[PDB]
Amino acid sequence: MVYEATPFDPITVKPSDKRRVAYFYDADVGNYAYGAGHPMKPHRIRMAHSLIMNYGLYKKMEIYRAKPATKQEMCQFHTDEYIDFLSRVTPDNLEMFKRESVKFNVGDDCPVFDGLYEYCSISGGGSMEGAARLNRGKCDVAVNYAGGLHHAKKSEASGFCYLNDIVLGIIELLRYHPRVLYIDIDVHHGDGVEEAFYTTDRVMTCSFHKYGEFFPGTGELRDIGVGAGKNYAVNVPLRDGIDDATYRSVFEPVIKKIMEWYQPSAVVLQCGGDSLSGDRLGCFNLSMEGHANCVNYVKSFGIPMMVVGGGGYTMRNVARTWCFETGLLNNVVLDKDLPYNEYYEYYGPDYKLSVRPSNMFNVNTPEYLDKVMTNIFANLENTK
Amino acid sequence: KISLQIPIKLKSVLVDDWEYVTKDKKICRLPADVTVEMVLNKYEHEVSQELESPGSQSQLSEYCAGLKLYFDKCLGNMLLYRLERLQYDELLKKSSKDQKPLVPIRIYGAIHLLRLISVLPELISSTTMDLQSCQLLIKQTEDFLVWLLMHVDEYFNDKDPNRSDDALYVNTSSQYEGVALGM
Amino acid sequence: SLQIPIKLKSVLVDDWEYVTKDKKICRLPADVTVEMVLNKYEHEVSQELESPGSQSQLSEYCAGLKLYFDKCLGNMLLYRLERLQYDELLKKSSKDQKPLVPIRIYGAIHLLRLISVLPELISSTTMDLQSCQLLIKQTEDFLVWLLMHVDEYFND
Amino acid sequence: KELLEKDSKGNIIKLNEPSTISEDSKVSVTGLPLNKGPSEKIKRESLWNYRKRNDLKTFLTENMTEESNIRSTIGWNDFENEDFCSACNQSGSFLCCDTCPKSFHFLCLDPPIDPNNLPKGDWHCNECKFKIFINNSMATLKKIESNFIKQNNNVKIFAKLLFNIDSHNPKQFQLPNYIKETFPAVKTGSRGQYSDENDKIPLTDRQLFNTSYGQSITKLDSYNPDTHIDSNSGKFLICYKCNQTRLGSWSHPENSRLIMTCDYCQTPWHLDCVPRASFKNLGSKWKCPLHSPTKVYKKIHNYKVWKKQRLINKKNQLYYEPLQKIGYQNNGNIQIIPTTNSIKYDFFDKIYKSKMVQKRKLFQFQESLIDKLVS
Amino acid sequence: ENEDFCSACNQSGSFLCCDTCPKSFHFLCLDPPIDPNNLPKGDWHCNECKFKIFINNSMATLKKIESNFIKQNNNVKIFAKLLFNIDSHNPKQFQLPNYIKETFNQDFKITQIDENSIKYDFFDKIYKSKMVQKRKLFQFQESLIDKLVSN
Amino acid sequence: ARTKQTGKAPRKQLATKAA
Amino acid sequence: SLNEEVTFFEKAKRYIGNKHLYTEFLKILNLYSQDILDLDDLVEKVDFYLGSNKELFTWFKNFVGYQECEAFGPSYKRLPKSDTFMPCSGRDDMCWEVLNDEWVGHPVWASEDSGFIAHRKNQYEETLFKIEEERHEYDFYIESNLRTIQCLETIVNKIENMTENEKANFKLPPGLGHTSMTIYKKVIRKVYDKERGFEIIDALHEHPAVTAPVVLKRLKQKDEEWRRAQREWNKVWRELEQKVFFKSLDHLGLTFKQADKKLLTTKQLISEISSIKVDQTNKKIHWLTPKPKSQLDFDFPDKNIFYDILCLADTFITHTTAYSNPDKERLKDLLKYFISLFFSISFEKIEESLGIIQNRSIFNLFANTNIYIFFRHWTTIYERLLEIKQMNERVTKEINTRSTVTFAKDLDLLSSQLSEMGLDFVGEDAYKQVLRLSRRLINGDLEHQWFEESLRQAYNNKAFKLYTIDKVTQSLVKHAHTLMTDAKTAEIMALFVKDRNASTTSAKDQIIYRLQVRSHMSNTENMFRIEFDKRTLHVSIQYIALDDL
Ligand SMILES: [Zn+2]
Ligand SMILES: [Zn+2]
Ligand SMILES: [Zn+2]
Ligand SMILES: [Zn+2]
Ligand SMILES: [Zn+2]
Ligand SMILES: [Zn+2]
Ligand SMILES: [Zn+2]
DSSP: OOOOOOOOOOOOOOTTOOOOEEEEOOGGGGGOOOOTTOSOOTHHHHHHHHHHHHTTGGGGSEEEEEOOOOHHHHTTTSOHHHHHHHHHOOSGGGTTOSHHHHHSOBBTTBOOOTTHHHHHHHHHHHHHHHHHHHHTTSOSEEEETTOOOTTOOSSOOBTTBSSOHHHHHHHHHHTTOSOEEEEEOSSSOOHHHHHHTSSOSSEEEEEEEEOSSOTTOOOOTTOOOSGGGTTOEEEEEEOTTOOHHHHHHHHHHHHHHHHHHHOOSEEEEEEOGGGBTTOSSOOOOBOHHHHHHHHHHHHTTOOOEEEEEOOOSSHHHHHHHHHHHHHHTTTOOOOSSOOOOTTGGGGTTTOOSOOOOOOOOOOOOHHHHHHHHHHHHHHGGGOO | OOOOOOOHHHHHHHHHHHIIIIISOEEEOSSOSSBHHHHHHHHHHHHHHHOOOHHHHHHHHHHHHHHHHHHHHHHHHHSSOSSTHHHHHHHHHHHHHTTOOOOHHHHSBHHHHHHHHHHHHHHHHTSOOOHHHHHHHHHHHHHHHHHHHHTHHHHSOOOOTTTOTTOSEEEOOHHHHHHHTTO | OOOOOHHHHHHHHHHHHHHHSOSOOOOSSOSSBHHHHHHHHHHHHHHHOOSHHHHHHHHHHHHHHHHHHHHHTTTTSOOTTTHHHHHHHHHHHTTSSOOOOSTTTOBSHHHHHHHHHHHHHHTTSOOOSHHHHHHHHHHHHHHHHHHHSHHHHOOO | OOOEEEOTTSOEEEEOOOOGGGSTTOOOTTSSOTTSOOOHHHHHHHSSOOOOOOOOOTTSHHHHOEEEOOOTTSSOOOOOOOSSOTTTOOOSEEEEOSSSSOEEESSSSSSOOOSSSOOSSOOOOHHHHHHHHHHHSSSOHHHHHHHHHHHOOSOSTTHHHHHHTSSSOOOOOOOOHHHHTTOTTOEEOTTSOEEOSSSOOOOOHHHHTSSOSSOOTTOOSSOOOTTSBOTTTOSBOOOTTTOOOOOOOSSSGGGOOOEEEOSSSOOEEETTTTTOSSOOOSSSOOOOTTSOOSEEEEEOOOEEEEEOOOOOOTTTOOEEOOSOOSSOOOOSOEEEOOOOOHHHHHHHHHHHHHHHHHHHHHHHHHHHHHHHTTO | OOOSSOTTTSSOOSOOBOSSSOOBOOSSSSSSOOOTTOOOSSOOOOHHHHHHHHHTTOHHHHHHHHHHHHHHOGGGGGGHHHHHHHHTOOOOOOOOOHHHHOOOGGGGOEEEEOHHHHHHHHHHHHHHHHHHHHHHHHHHHHHHHHHHHHO | OOEEEOOOSSSOGGGSSOO | OOHHHHHHHHHHHHHHOSHHHHHHHHHHHHHHHTTOSOHHHHHHHHHHHSSSOHHHHHHHHHHHTOOOOOOOOTTOEEOOHHHHOOOOTTOOHHHHHHSOOSEEOOHHHHTTSSOOOOOOOOHHHHHHHHHHHHHHHHHHHHHHHHHHHHHHHHHHHHHHTSOSTTTSSOOOOTTTTSSOSSHHHHHHHHHSOHHHHHHHHHHHHHOHHHHHHHHHHHHHHHHHHHHHHHHHHHHHHHHHHHHHHHHHHOSTTTSHHHHHHHHSSHHHHHHHHHHHHHHHHHHHTTSOSSOOSOSEEEEOOOSHHHHHHHHHHHHHHHHOOSSOHHHHHHHHHHHHHHHHHHSSOOHHHHHHTOOEEOSOOEEEEEEOHHHHHHHHHHHHHHHHHHHHHTTHHHHHHHHHTOOOOHHHHHTTOSOOTTTTTSOSOTTSOHHHHHHHHHHHHHHTSSOHHHHHHHHHHHHTTTTGGGTTHHHHHHHHHHHHHHHHSSTTTHHHHHHHHHHHHSOSEEHHHHHHHHHHHHHHSOSSSOOEEEEEETTTTEEEEEEOTTTOO
16 A cells, blocks of 8 residues: 555656756766777767757856866775776786786676776766765755766676766765765666665665666665665665656655655765666666656755766667756756757757657556565664 | 495585585685694594504504595695685685695695595595505595584584674685686 | 382382282282273373373373283283283183273283383384483373372282 | 988978878778768668758857866776686686696696796696606606605505596596485586576577567566466466466556466466566576475574475485374474374364363462462 | 293293294293193294294385384374384293393485374474463563562 | 687676676 | 364365465474474465465464564675775775675676576667667767867967977877877877877877877868768668667567467457456455456447447458458448447437336347457457547647757758658647548558558557557458358347347346357357446446356
């Protein structure tokens, strides 16, 4: 009696919740390519960014170019040898590093391109500078789409993620905030961020993810954290083809119960574009509206937050949804008609802002989601 | 044809080892709380008392010393799986750092000794050793095995590494598993 | 591993002196027979035994005993001049067409004879480990229940 | 090729451009070089039909990007060798024996070789090194074996065992067959890894990646009603918990609830009745929530673990029936037997008698409890 | 074929020579107290000899018959193995035992159990656990009552 | 010392997002 | 307090059913009884065993005496303290306190050393990903070259307005004064040769005065050539995207033809009704003593849809050639008569649009498999068209108010197909248009692919269920043809005609009508009770196969 089938309401901003928005973008972050046959493409950031500028959105926010992270700063979560290897490896001298290649998983899935250290530094610096600007009160919403590498771990690189910049952002938030809530709406499970904060009660990691034989396999419902972090790691397993109304009806009660139970002081929001419909690796059926209602609902709470974009392997959909997120964070709703950007040829054939959902089966039954949120709500009674 | 009558409790112990190393990817807590030299020694003190025959005492000491020398020489040759060979390498590097030669006899636990006992008939069948010596070696091995059964609850205990820090087995890291089974 | 108090040990060697060095034997109905002592045994211990499974194994013990006293009196629990006694008992049984069962004619003396011969006999054949402790615990609580009121049945 | 044409004093004059056409026609991901566009042979099927403003606000970014360094951590805080290892029989990076066609893993040797501190000259295996030492040694093998036997006088029985393993190349440990054959459930994987009855048959490449789009083995992308119907019986797979089979109607396929079968007892269970979100297609065999566990943890109040014994073949396994029925302290390893009227009434009377025993136990105590308070 | 003393009563007397075993018995040293001059004509098998011809000196038949005879009478079950030894015992006088004169495939055995006995031990365990927790709470209540009275 | 590969740098590519 | 105590075990045995499951239940009970299983684990196991039997599980809970940590989860293991001590130089006390270094998880451990299952994609989605791949390829190289051109031209205009006396020893730092260390290196190594790119980089760092302008000129030439190739590639990419994208976004509609061929058969329609009856009979013995007299429920809120289906049927009849003209007119008036007699619509409305129970409103049709399958096909078409009609006004307002963006009109990006040939839905009602198009698809003047493309473009792939409208109306026509031309089948119709025409019937009339219907069919065939209500037009279909016997 927890799950309620509610139709998807239209997205409405709150005029009484105006936030100072600091957007973080480095112009070099688009000039790194993972590989010739590779799906992760950082270029999707800048046509997101070109949609911000062309939408005039920038005006409503403060644009910053964050200082790139150094090796030691990087070692706030990762080990010295892994950061060294990341700063020292190039595609040229790959035959110098085979033991580190199997040790840190760098290779294949996470390839070795010669702008690896700079891309990781840009991402990490964006995350830490957004967290710093949240700490000092200079902004209420910190936006950094260059990061989002939530699959990286202490001494390995996985899931197209080398540096877990979200962990550094949460660490920098923890120096000024006692309780930090991380919400991962990526279709994959945030294994690195949840593993980093598994044994602590200061960080609560809620991950709405597909859990089947899907990557990374972690994030099962019984995973609730150990030690002092027991019932402080919420995993929401979902099946294929969840649509906007279903995702709203699972997201809003769980996040509401977290707010009124965990009561965090800061929020980090992994905005994965791979949870959209038509994604190359994702298997969800979320439209842009459905992806954006989560960010609007978490913006309605008024907690200082940091919106950080992660996955997304079809560049047009993730760019359009990131532009719509950034527009929603300035309490405006962007019209569904694109202005002229340089990358205008991507968004065919209608050239509108909307990402159309596919007509595939919403196999997430109400009974299964009712049981899942009943178990989650039962586990959440101990977070007072 | 050389046959060994290993009791099925230690057979299940060896099969559980194989399960923990190859499937569950668990390695040995090294150096173990109960090592091989220790067990062999205890075995001797226990039995030596029972047997008074001095030739039997000499044999028993001969068998124990030969098992010690054979173990050390063979542990890194054919006694450990591919997953534990990186632990063997890091033990060798740690020993060479301290300028002490490595002695498997005192670093490895009794499960590797049980592996040696299990793999012993194949090694005996591969050398030109006469029938009476083979029979007496098998016989002392059976006495060691029936001594191990009475003490199976204190040398091979079952404990989850996720719950006990004093378990004989420890979980692996991705990095170890990677370097062990990737290159 | 069975313990028999001299209270019983003294009375069984005294009965041995009566059956070997003396012609005096037990009576033809043997005064109190075994059904009443075993029925009051269950009627106090099963009323003192707490869980139903304990009462279940108690019933079994007594019944088994009853069948063992039926099936064992003619083989082990006999002395001199008692063969002839059991002989005209079986000749009298065949006269009235009711069959020869040895429980309703005998007394408690060959019961504690049976628990006296019990531990050597229990080790003759193949037996469990813990079934032996169950049997010896049943014999011990039966004998201490006898030791509460020895003088009821054992007064000359 | 004289790139910088320096003067007589070393001053720079003019450089010559290198061969740009050396890699100007490299094939990109489009199948054509970046110098040229698409060819006509893809323009036939690419285009619909083939017959043989600059108001950008995206150049103002660099003016409004202010640097951000306000973090608290700013500043500082011949023969070809084999493709498999000769020790573990697995692929990977190998060190190759020179005078021997066997190749080894870098970690598989005695001692294991660092992948950066290679031997400078030639490397031989232990068997090859023993062969060179024998060829080198004038004494015949048996002479060296006898000399090692009399030299190692302290140990005689293991002396041949000590001697003959120096000739043996290092190998990964594998359990012998008679260790494995006593447990029929335990199998050996392709890499020599452990495998047992709680392991699925590995699905071949045809089933996962070489299926049609509509029919996927995940059974989540389409309405498949041929899963609620038993194949060998034709009846409906009734789920255990809900006691229903939600087949759907193909006009309302959202009313169809997904159902799987257990991999051991074939008990059908809905994916919502047991909280699951997949069909466990690969990996370990799925076990319905109804089976008895083979491993349990109990609190001491440390802890105590219990594991069920592995299955043993009928030659080395004997089943015994206890003589004691009530209270037989078994280890948990149990086997049930079939049942062969008075037992029901005997139970009934035993529960009855024990229940007034419990009642009188309560009464004989509560009277002492209420008689304690007056004193 | 015969012995000078009776193996049952341990004194000499009128003996009866068994065919295979050399032990002989008196006319009262048997499970029938056989009347003299009235023995039924035959080879005079004893109890052990009749057991040998009943089992045909073969193992597996006697194992399946022990299984059967333990099987039918479960009301004498804990004594059921003890009921065969009489049929394989030649009867004798009560020889008073010594302490009465004064003053590995077997490790992995699967228990074969029936549903009624599992049911009995389940009722046993729940009743024991329930009433030791009831008693211990009753003793704790009395103890706190005595402590509050004394304080 | 002659060496040869297999040429995959990481392991268990099967258990990865892009294999 | 006694009878349920002694009967609980065999009552639970009846409930568990399968002996095996009862064997494992007894194993669970013994494992609790041997001081091995904890009481909470026993409680949960019995909850999984007797969950639906509330009374029995409640009795077990209170009779056992249950009163309402260390849950590690399945995807995490604990490292020892030896592997934890790995130096992270940036960690102060707070990071050492709040970060977990002992509990880890991996995709390999979570896969149970088996792997992962990727999501299946269409070939249209795959070629969309290939188009996106080539787009990212061209744009990444062009934008990297443009950034290097910007940096190089900054250096060039810095070096132009200075003299030659200090131009000889003027040097450039690594990165050329930019925020990146490697982007210009990538551009140089791509544009020039592999072996010569490094030495050009060294010549640029040591002597930028001579190397920088020729490098900038090459890079600019390569940039303009790449942009020309990218534009005349972008034409191809845009046309292929317009050809592919809407088919790629269609998931169920791409396989709906084979799925509708496979699943809209007699066997599956019998399977659905039998499964619903099996569910009702299985849950009848547990609760719900008023067992319902119906299994399937159909609603019919709109009556114009019947005229639309009739128009499609007559369009197929006129188009087809495998049937004779008397058979064609018999199909026409048979369908019209059945629709006029079953429902409340009169024949005049059809022609102009194309214990005595007196004054009864509930009418029962007893049918064999043929009439049931024909009615199921009719309800399939009705629900498929009602899904379109119930959202017809919103999709009409969306199509009519389709404001295209300006720069696509100025640069003719938007597709022109589905227009010149008249497959868009602009200016007409969406539902009428669908019917018109369908009629055109039935008549054979319209291709299947263009019909599917028009439907998925107009309805945003929500009209995927109408891709096989011609096949299902063909099957409905065939089922009506076998409905009147089969022995022991047309007489059941005639009996339904007599039952519907003669109103004011008692219950005994319904019973004798039932056995008279049964007579015509075999004693093995299936009986279907199709109940129609004049009020609200609700149809309740009940499965009574071999029940009334
Ligand atoms: Zn993701
Ligand atoms: Zn070699
Ligand atoms: Zn190897
Ligand atoms: Zn099962
Ligand atoms: Zn179910
Ligand atoms: Zn005699
Ligand atoms: Zn005889």
